[PDB]
Design a protein around this motif. Sequence first.
Motif, PDB file in Angstrom:
ATOM      1  N   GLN A 150       4.626   8.421  11.361  1.00 13.78           N
ATOM      2  CA  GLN A 150       6.394   8.392  10.343  1.00 13.78           C
ATOM      3  C   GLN A 150       7.056   9.695  11.013  1.00 13.78           C
ATOM      4  O   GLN A 150       8.439   9.936  10.882  1.00 13.78           O
ATOM      5  CB  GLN A 150       5.765   9.620   9.534  1.00 13.78           C
TER       6      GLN A 150
ATOM      7  N   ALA B 268      -5.315   3.060   6.142  1.00 15.07           N
ATOM      8  CA  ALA B 268      -5.509   4.153   5.395  1.00 15.07           C
ATOM      9  C   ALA B 268      -6.118   5.216   6.061  1.00 15.07           C
ATOM     10  O   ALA B 268      -5.119   6.496   5.727  1.00 15.07           O
ATOM     11  CB  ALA B 268      -4.635   3.760   4.452  1.00 15.07           C
TER      12      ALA B 268
ATOM     13  N   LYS C 139       0.071   4.025   0.868  1.00  9.73           N
ATOM     14  CA  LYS C 139      -0.028   5.162   2.219  1.00  9.73           C
ATOM     15  C   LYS C 139       1.112   4.422   3.579  1.00  9.73           C
ATOM     16  O   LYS C 139       1.115   5.158   3.662  1.00  9.73           O
ATOM     17  CB  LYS C 139      -1.352   5.543   2.394  1.00  9.73           C
TER      18      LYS C 139
ATOM     19  N   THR D 238      -5.122   9.325   8.060  1.00 12.38           N
ATOM     20  CA  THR D 238      -4.217  10.625   7.431  1.00 12.38           C
ATOM     21  C   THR D 238      -3.148  10.820   8.687  1.00 12.38           C
ATOM     22  O   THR D 238      -2.103  11.189   8.934  1.00 12.38           O
ATOM     23  CB  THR D 238      -4.886  11.352   6.669  1.00 12.38           C
TER      24      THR D 238
ATOM     25  N   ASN E 293       0.516  -1.180  -0.074  1.00 22.90           N
ATOM     26  CA  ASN E 293       0.285   0.035   0.384  1.00 22.90           C
ATOM     27  C   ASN E 293       1.109   1.321   0.436  1.00 22.90           C
ATOM     28  O   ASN E 293       1.599   1.780   0.553  1.00 22.90           O
ATOM     29  CB  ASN E 293      -1.288  -0.121   1.354  1.00 22.90           C
TER      30      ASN E 293
ATOM     31  N   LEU F  31      -1.143   8.802  10.963  1.00 19.50           N
ATOM     32  CA  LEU F  31       0.212   7.886  10.035  1.00 19.50           C
ATOM     33  C   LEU F  31       1.312   9.402  10.023  1.00 19.50           C
ATOM     34  O   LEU F  31       2.133   8.665   9.804  1.00 19.50           O
ATOM     35  CB  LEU F  31      -0.227   7.321   8.401  1.00 19.50           C
ATOM     36  N   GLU F  32       0.662  10.446   9.431  1.00 19.01           N
ATOM     37  CA  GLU F  32       1.812  11.485  10.102  1.00 19.01           C
ATOM     38  C   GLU F  32       2.659  11.769  10.560  1.00 19.01           C
ATOM     39  O   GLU F  32       3.696  11.789  11.023  1.00 19.01           O
ATOM     40  CB  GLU F  32       1.020  13.451   9.478  1.00 19.01           C
TER      41      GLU F  32
END
Length: 164
Positions: free
Chosen positions: A122, A112, A83, A115, A81, A118-119
Amino acid sequence: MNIFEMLRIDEGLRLKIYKDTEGYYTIGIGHLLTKSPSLNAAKSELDKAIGRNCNGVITKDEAEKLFNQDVDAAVRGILRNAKLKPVYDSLDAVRRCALINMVFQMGETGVAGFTNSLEMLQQKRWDEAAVNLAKSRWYNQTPNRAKRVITTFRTGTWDAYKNL
């Protein structure tokens, strides 16, 4: 502790079709069979899945085989994936398990959609991401399991599971 033990803790093991927290027909270790209301649709999916007439029941071995396949598909799905892959690659080994766990539960598509979290992940902003992840239907519906995962991402340790 590893992905399999973590997930075995979160999902449990059932050898008879059962309904999940959402009411869907599941068997083994969180293996979703169908979202359809028909126990009959469920039983047919199950036979298809196992390759025998199970009559709604499976052995431990069958449960385990299904689990292996599912974890495998979860990992491959993340890796494919666009993302998820980059998040996954940026994480340490334990946090990697937390993302696999989420995908096993809610599917690639659903994770997914997180968003923002997930940011933060990271970016390694542990605390902020934990707070953001708690603002979800996910956390509201399965709060104890969501808390375990969130703690896992927050700390990077297996503490939330050491208890259990």
